[PDB]
């Protein structure tokens, strides 16, 4: 970083900020699980994850769930953060669409419950375990809903590798569409009812009002991460997959104006969420209300986590003005 100090715009959110009472114990347990997995090969990356307190994100985004549910979700978050850093955005696989695409089938077969992972397949061994643990506390329909979100997330990583390979910044329209699936947020939304020990009916899950609120929550989390992860992403492939970079490139903005435009889109998405929620509230069933409250806790908890996590704050210059 060179140039005058950047102002990080606020990310206003009226949703309740809560945290699971089991945060400390489960964060430590889940980190131990990750450290034992060999999903991360470097002691530096493992320690970076320990300092990042991934279980604090789990606890803030799922504040109501029992301890066993929090531990399962926290393990899933650790899998995602590790996969993101070690595989998806790694130099080996992340710059070749063909290579990443051809590497997925064995992992997809593990996800389907069709294939035993090899002893050397750290991500496969962990994914098999998580599939079995989710299956113990979820209906076939809930498991397939989760599995579907994971497959789309995996396929979306090929699109990222494609952009890296051709050295292009994706266009705003392409980026905002694919950003809903490149971040695996839907895989976490898929575990809200499972974690809470309830089951949304197909008609509730797929209701246009519920899908709209899910999509807006997913936009907010994607764009909020883009704003706060911008500095650390600058060190890796020019922060290519980041709404700040995408808007700065395709609307020819200064970095400071791109940051403000991302905050404007956040404020617009919050307003859209509140408008649709008012309509949903007229019919919403008990499970639907719990799920939507789940989305609100996720959006707000994510912001609280990201403003304080060693994963993001360290890369911002000392003179950065935080909101």
Q: How far is CA 216 from the centre of its chain?
A: 14
158 binds, among Na ion, Mg ion, a copy of itself, none (CB under 5 to 8 A by kind): a copy of itself
Which residue in 42, 105, 197, 314 binds a copy of itself (CB under 8 A)?
Answer: 105
Regarding 224 and contact with Na ion (CB under 5 A), the answer is no
User: Which of residues 161, 192, 243, 258 is near a copy of itself by CB under 8 A?
Assistant: 161
Whole-angstrom distance, CA of residue 126 vs CA of residue 231: 30
| Residue 222 contact among Na ion, a copy of itself, Mg ion, none, beta carbon within 5 to 8 Å by kind | none
What is the rounded distance in angstroms from the CA atom of residue 215 to the CA atom of residue 269?
10
String of DSSP letters for 189-201: HTTHHHHHT----
- Interaction between residue 139 and a copy of itself (CB under 8 A): yes
Q: Which of 178, 164, 158 is nearest to 240 (CA)?
A: 164
If binding is defined by CB under 8 A, does position 109 make contact with a copy of itself?
A: yes
161 binds, among Mg ion, Na ion, a copy of itself, none (CB under 5 to 8 A by kind): a copy of itself
Q: Establish if 162 lies at the interface with a copy of itself (CB under 8 A).
A: yes
151 binding a copy of itself? (CB under 8 A): yes
Please pick, from the candidates 17, 32, 148, 254, the single residue that binds a copy of itself as defined by CB under 8 A: 148
Structure tokens at 304: 């609280």
Residue 116 is given by DSSP the state: P
Q: Which of 90, 106, 172, 308 binds a copy of itself (CB under 8 A)?
A: 106
Q: Could you give the CA distance from residue 26 to residue 70 in angstroms, rounded to a whole number?
A: 7
| Long-range contact pairs involving 280-283 (C-beta distance under 8 Å, separation at least 24) | 280/209, 280/210, 280/213, 283/209
Find the binder of Mg ion among 28, 68, 84, 174 (CB under 5 A): 84
CB of 213 to a copy of itself, least distance (A): 14
């Amino acid at each position: 970083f060179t140039g005058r100090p950047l102002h990080i715009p606020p990310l206003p959110c009226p949703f309740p900020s809560e945290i699971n009472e089991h945060a400390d114990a489960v964060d430590e347990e889940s980190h131990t699980w990750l450290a034992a997995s060999h999903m991360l090969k470097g002691a530096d990356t493992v320690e970076h994850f320990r300092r990042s307190k991934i279980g604090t994100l789990a606890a803030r985004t799922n504040p109501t769930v029992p301890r066993d549910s929090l531990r399962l979700i926290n393990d899933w978050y650790n899998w995602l953060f590790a996969f993101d850093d070690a595989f998806c955005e790694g130099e080996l696989m992340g710059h070749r669409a063909s290579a990443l695409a051809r590497a997925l089938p064995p992992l997809l077969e593990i996800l389907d419950g069709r294939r035993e992972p090899d002893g050397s397949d750290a991500f496969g061994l962990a994914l098999k375990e998580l599939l079995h643990r989710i299956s113990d506390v979820a209906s076939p329909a809930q498991v397939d809903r989760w599995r579907t979100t994971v497959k789309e997330y995996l396929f979306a990583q090929i699109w990222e590798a494609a952009n890296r390979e051709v050295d292009l910044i994706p266009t705003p329209d392409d980026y905002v569409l694919m950003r809903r699936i490149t971040g695996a947020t839907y895989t976490c939304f898929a575990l809200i009812d499972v974690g809470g020990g309830y089951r949304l009916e197909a008609e509730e899950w797929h209701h246009p009002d519920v899908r709209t609120l899910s999509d807006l929550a997913c936009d907010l989390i994607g764009w909020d991460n883009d704003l706060l992860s911008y500095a650390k992403e600058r060190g890796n492939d020019k922060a290519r997959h980041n709404l700040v970079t995408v808007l700065a490139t395709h609307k020819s903005l200064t970095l400071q104006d791109a940051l403000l435009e991302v905050a404007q889109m956040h404020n617009d998405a919050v307003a859209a969420f509140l408008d649709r929620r008012a309509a949903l509230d007229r019919w919403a069933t008990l499970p639907v209300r719990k799920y939507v409250r789940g989305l609100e806790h996720w959006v707000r908890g994510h912001i609280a986590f990201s403003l304080g996590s060693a994963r993001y704050v360290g890369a911002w210059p000392d003179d950065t003005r935080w909101p």
